[PDB]
Design a protein around this ligand. Sequence first.
Ligand code: NA
Lengths: 211, 221
Amino acid sequence: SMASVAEYGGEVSFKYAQSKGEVYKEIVKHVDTQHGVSESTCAHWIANKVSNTMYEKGHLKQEAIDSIKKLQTEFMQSGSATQQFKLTDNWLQEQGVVPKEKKVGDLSRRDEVAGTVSKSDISALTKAILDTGSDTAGAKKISINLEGGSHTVSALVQGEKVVFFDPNFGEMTFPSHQKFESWLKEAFWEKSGYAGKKEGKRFFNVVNYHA
Amino acid sequence: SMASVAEYGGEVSFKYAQSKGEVYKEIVKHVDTQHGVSESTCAHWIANKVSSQGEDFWNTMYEGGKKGHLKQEAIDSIKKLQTEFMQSGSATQQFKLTDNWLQEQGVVPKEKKVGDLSRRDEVAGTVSKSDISALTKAILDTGSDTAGAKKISINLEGGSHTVSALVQGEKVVFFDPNFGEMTFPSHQKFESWLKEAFWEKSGYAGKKEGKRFFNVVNYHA
Ligand code: NA
């Protein structure tokens, strides 16, 4: 967003009539909302299989949809990913689903398998899904992270003058480094959708050209 | 919930009439294409600012009489470069292509020199929800000089997805709320289908290299 540029002592030089940034924020909201529905639906599917169908062509029963919507809302309004996944786990135990435990030395701990996937390797994920440990049978709730996109912005710095250009919003000018730095950190980073919801490092690369 | 399930000896038990997975694949296409447009537009903006003959007005990319739009000539040229960028395949070759275009337009990449040797003045690092201090320094740093132009690549947060499974001996039931329910009569048939068919066709695989987190929670059947 560029609502705050003038508040931080900058000027908007150009504003795109159709903000591809606003489209990106709607995409983030969509993918976030759809995670809630996916998590809630998988929880309901797991509870249904371990206790006999949730299906009505190509739709869930209305009572399943109402219950999925309820859990999804609660899931969404839980803060951290840790609290969200704890809320779904509590719901599953309330429905009589029993989480597996494993021994690590003498101690009982949750039978969760954490790991990594990539474009070219899902071997560890596949083994975690297929493993039933001591038993012949198991239900799994599988959380997977999706690839984020790539974005390019540009800047011209001339002494204390900073021109910042985001093809998703437009062009802004700040008359000092400090005014640009405060605006970028305190206004733009969150409001833009580039910050994300989770903690975690993402790469950046700056290529420098002569002015 | 595709035709690939039966090809790998499985059965579709349920198919969502409205696939949230198909919507997700359209989103991936959009965000990928929009990287092309963002890269090409930033390249043009950099060439315009560095070429500039004093005042901005003399050679703006902005349409004078149409508020909040680029000139049609700038749009056509941006679409040309974006196409070339898109056809490159390999992020290394894509960025090399943009760099060649920038030099063709008279833009001069900065070098770090030690004795007789050069390398590109490019600064990598990391950002997060709560820290962009290293990014901010890389943008503001002009090295030797008081002036410089920057093309800034930022990686975005991917979303999260949940799927589920039930394994009973050799029977694998896999459920993706974005597609539906599939059943495989052996582990082998599930593993081959997941790795060779589903992972790419789902949109979950991605285009770039990069490790992404998964978590499997096990419940008694
Ligand atoms: Na400006």
